[PDB]
Amino acid sequence: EFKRIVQRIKDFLRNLV
Structure with a gap:
């Protein structure tokens, strides 16, 4: 998404994987 x-982009990969 x-x-x-x-x-x-605070998370990106920390929002699921």
Whole structure:
């Protein structure tokens, strides 16, 4: 996704894997 509150890339890989 990278579009669900991940725009800041704060997590990206920490949002699932």
